[PDB]
Amino acid sequence: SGYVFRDKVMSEFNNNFRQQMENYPKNSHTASILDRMQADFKCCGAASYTDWEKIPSMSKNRVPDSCCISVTVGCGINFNEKAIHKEGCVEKIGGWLRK
């Protein structure tokens, strides 16, 4: 019942971002695109980094390496909370889709 946005185009971009998060571990091509957005915009997940805890095939206590403040190979495996971006991506990436 609750919704993060009211505009139709903004809420559908939000679901599109969350949909490709589900396809992150099922496709390497999909995962590479999201790694750029999370790296360039310095963010993790849709609204928070804790969104990854709900993604199947995403290991426990693991976030994508692009979520780390400094992107190194394997930095997301057994990550530390103080070494990743906690803020989500949806608002800062597509906020201009609001009315």
């Epitope: 609750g2 993060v4 849709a46 928070s48 906690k86 989500g88 949806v90």
Partner: nanobody
């Protein structure tokens, strides 16, 4: 925009269970410090359950530890309050709050436990 609409309140017997929901509109629950309050008529208002933003942890009042469990679903942007082993001392109107600089709350929902 800060909307908080409590629902799920009702009447249950002593020792039963009840689940409250707090449909928040206008902000993501995953990055918001949210807590469940309650106030019975005659008594003073009090906070019972809480979940901080991101993974900063949850917190519970001592009178409800182990019985109540606060949860956070992102697909519906809703904070839940699972209330197990309810006591007649838990009869109150339950409100959900949000702390984002200031405080915002909803209308609340009535919870009553018989016997």
């Amino acid at each position: 925009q800060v909307q908080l609409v409590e629902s799920g309140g009702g009447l249950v017997q002593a020792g039963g269970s009840l689940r409250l929901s707090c449909a928040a509109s206008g902000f993501p629950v995953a990055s918001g410090n949210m807590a469940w309050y309650r106030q019975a008529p005659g008594k003073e208002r009090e906070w019972v359950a809480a979940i901080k933003s991101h993974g900063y942890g949850t917190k519970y009042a001592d009178s409800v530890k182990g019985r109540f469990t606060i949860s956070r679903d992102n697909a519906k942007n809703t904070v839940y309050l699972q209330m197990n082993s309810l006591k007649p001392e838990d009869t109150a109107v339950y409100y959900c709050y949000v702390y984002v600089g200031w405080l915002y709350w909803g209308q609340g929902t009535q919870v009553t436990v018989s016997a």
